[PDB]
Structure 1
Amino acid sequence: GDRICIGYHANNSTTQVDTIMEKNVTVTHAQDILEKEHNGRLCSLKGVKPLILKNCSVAGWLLGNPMCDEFLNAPEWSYIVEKDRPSNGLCYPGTFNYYEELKHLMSSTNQFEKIQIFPRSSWSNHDASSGVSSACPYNGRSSFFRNVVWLIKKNNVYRTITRTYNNTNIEDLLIIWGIHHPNNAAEQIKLYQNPSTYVSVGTSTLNQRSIPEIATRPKVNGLSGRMEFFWTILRPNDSITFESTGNFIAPEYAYKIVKKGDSAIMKSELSYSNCDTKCQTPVGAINSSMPFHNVHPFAIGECPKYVKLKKLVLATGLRNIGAIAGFIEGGWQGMVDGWYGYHHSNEQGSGYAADKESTQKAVDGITNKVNSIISKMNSQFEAVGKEFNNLERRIENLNKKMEDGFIDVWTYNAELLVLMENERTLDLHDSNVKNLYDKVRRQLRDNAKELGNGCFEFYHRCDNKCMESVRNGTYDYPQYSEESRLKREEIDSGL
């Protein structure tokens, strides 16, 4: 009898972690940091709803394709949702110049207010009602974009248009207009009389003379003609003047840019639900509590950092071991209120007290090290949506290689940090356990025999209140020295 052992926690845990050195290492306590689920729904972002475009493209929305919903309420939005291949775009076919740049403006815009700048009924000298088409059906009747006017010769005459608008608002105006490219020389005269026309636009920054480019083209949405749209931002206190002799697709409504901020165009097929989120991906929203996730790289909102991993587990406690007779052989299920501690084995005692002078000192630096790991990726790369046209494949690939490149870099960093500090965490517990034993051996010097399994046997009587002499860094050699003095030479001369 008369012993004492140094030992460590063990429990029912089957959590597993990895290191540089080993895989699947069972530990007492561990912390998952990777989010892997989403809810498959499309939600408001912290109370603010997305602008859902349904089957419409940004072009169809902005020009007012009759199949598309106008937003009369002038709502603000958190993000914009556009399907992958929207069916309602330029119902009258053609091109929309610097479309992808316009879409990129929307990513920093959170609210429009449509304002009328040239009322449809202010074109005295021209036909403002015949410009409609079977390609733009509203309720099965031929119609046209709601926000631009297809002006047409009146009484076989098309008087020169010169018309100006002064931006007397505080806000930038987004202004859109267009030009008609007819099918042949006869069509041009039929519509606009004058055989050779132009559309001239002028601001303090933009000077442009546009000219109708006639070609023989195959039918799109039934039509061989085309229309080409343009856009500009008219700054506060600047003015814009249009002059045309024909083919002018004139603006009616402009868009006051009333709120700039963090926004996005998300490409998703989902539809909106009664749902709110902190973090939205194109395939569903995420419970943003953990610091990493692998759901989708184009997450927006207050999001965890995206990494290309199947798992990310930080070790926090000891390995999980029976585990009998001191630390050399494993950990104690019997120890409950601590990670490292002791075992009494007394004339009075049984054992299993915990040393929380070093248990708390370890729970201190572990939970401090954990938060440090997470916050070290506070500035981790976050991907940003952009689109490119079919003649911008190089910069599109540049952009892909950059974003994938940063995701790979940070994936690597996140993994390496976890593996490396995991090895350091497990190694710390080892050194803490080995430190505990040494604290005791440096106290009980001669008065006890090292048993080689993690326990000491006393060459003297100790009793319970000396069993905290040893725990409290207080045991004094002298006051038990003379008793030990004698009993060990009794061993040296016993049987």
Structure 2
Amino acid sequence: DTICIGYHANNSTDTVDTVLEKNVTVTHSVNLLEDSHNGKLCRLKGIAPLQLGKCNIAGWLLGNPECDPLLPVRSWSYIVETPNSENGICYPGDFIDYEELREQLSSVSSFERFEIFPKESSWPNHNTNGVTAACSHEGKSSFYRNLLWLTEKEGSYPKLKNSYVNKKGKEVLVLWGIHHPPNSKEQQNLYQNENAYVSVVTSNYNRRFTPEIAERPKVRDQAGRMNYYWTLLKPGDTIIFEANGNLIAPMYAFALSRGFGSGIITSNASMHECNTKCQTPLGAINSSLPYQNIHPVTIGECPKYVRSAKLRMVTGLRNIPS
């Protein structure tokens, strides 16, 4: 009569690595590294993202006419730009503090696009119909949907002055532009004044702009330039615009709501009728594992990105079947 002491073995082919030994076959093991995603863009915590389509952030905020117009109010959990993004700034120039504005938008969860200076009542003494071939739409010269190109009316460009008081209870993002003609003949024709200036003031913003006339290499067939500026008008504050030329006046502004957990990503994945707690530019992750090797860019509640190809903890024994 005998009694023997022994240990479990099975048909498992799981392998793990240790400090002293690679490729140890074990009876039981647990994977800690998430490597699967669904290849889709999904709702994040029940909120659909903001897809910009053919526009980047600049094109959407200025209102590039080649992009499908968005609904007046949108709320989202993240912003998606496509890698193509054929449509951004269409009249060449500088977008001042553009990257700062993108960082601002990353904590924004909602916008309300409203008419800050209505077209037909704000500028009775100026021409508001200026368009350019650089911002064409359906093969016809057009202009930004949120801005107005003011030029002289009846041979005169009176000194204008308009203000807006923010009674929205939210930050209002205001965008405008400064045009720099390539020669003084165009400057005099468009704005009738050579020592023209633009002034924009609020309680914490104070800047003056002056045209700088020079002929430049043509960009999108334009030797002129258009510099774009922005500020966040605090609740209750007033913004005053003053100019005797060259102002690309605001027409629509955005009332912005602040949120948490958002950001901007680039993706060629497609929106689908799904929901996730974790979204990457390649797809959504449905997992409780502590690590993932799918993508370093994540939205929501996600596993930690690591470069490893395998992270397996042994739970059982070394597997030695007879």
Q: Would you call these one fold, judging by a TM-score over 0.5?
A: yes
1:29 aligns with 2:59: no
Show the counterpart of 1:265: 264
What aligned pairs does 1:417-436 form with structure 2 within 5 A after superposition?
none
Deviations 1:327-356 (A, max 9, x none): xxxxxxxxxxxxxxxxxxxxxxxxxxxxxx
Name which of structure 1's ranges 266-275 and 217-226 shifts more when overlaid on structure 2: 266-275
Aligned positions, number: 321
Decide which structure has greater strand share.
Answer: 2
Show the counterpart of 2:243: 244
**What is the SS of the residue equivalent to 2:239?**
strand
Show the counterpart of 2:302: 303
**What is the SS of the residue equivalent to 1:95?**
coil
TM-score, L = length of structure 1 = 0.63
1:41 aligns with 2:40: yes
Show the counterpart of 1:208: 207
What aligned pairs does 1:149-228 form with structure 2 within 5 A after superposition?
149-228=148-227
Deviations 1:137-186 (A, max 9, x none): 22222110010111010011000011111112210111111100111111
Give 1:98 deviation, angstroms: 0.3
Larger of the two Rg values belongs to structure: 1
**What is the SS of the residue equivalent to 1:222?**
coil
Give 1:274 deviation, angstroms: 3.0
C-alpha distance in 2, partners of 1:263/1:322?
52
What aligned pairs does 1:474-489 form with structure 2 within 5 A after superposition?
none
Deviations 1:244-295 (A, max 9, x none): 0100011111110124222111012233233332221112222223221101
Q: 1:137 to 1:258 in 2, by over 3 A?
A: same
Determine what percentage of the aligned residue pairs are the same residue.
55
Deviations 1:450-481 (A, max 9, x none): xxxxxxxxxxxxxxxxxxxxxxxxxxxxxxxx
Unaligned runs of 5+ in 2: none
TM-score, L = length of structure 2 = 0.96
Show the counterpart of 2:51: 52
C-alpha distance in 1, partners of 2:216/2:68?
30
Show the counterpart of 1:412: none
* Alignment check: 8 A CA contact 1:61 1:69 kept: no
Give 1:73 deviation, angstroms: 4.3
What aligned pairs does 1:2-151 form with structure 2 within 5 A after superposition?
3-122=2-121, 123-129=123-129, 131-151=130-150
C-alpha distance in 2, partners of 1:60/1:13?
56
C-alpha distance in 1, partners of 2:166/2:125?
24
- How large is the Cα RMSD of the aligned pairs? 1.4
Question: What amino acid sits opposite 2:135 in the alignment?
Answer: C
Decide which structure has greater helix share.
Answer: 1
Deviations 1:32-73 (A, max 9, x none): 111112222222223211111112110110111101223224
Show the counterpart of 1:462: none
Deviations 1:73-117 (A, max 9, x none): 412111111123521011111111000000001110111001211
C-alpha distance in 1, partners of 2:321/2:211?
88
Show the counterpart of 2:319: 320
**What is the SS of the residue equivalent to 2:167?**
coil
C-alpha distance in 1, partners of 2:194/2:228?
21
Unaligned runs of 5+ in 1: 324-495
Deviations 1:180-233 (A, max 9, x none): 011111110010011111111111111101111222222222211111110000
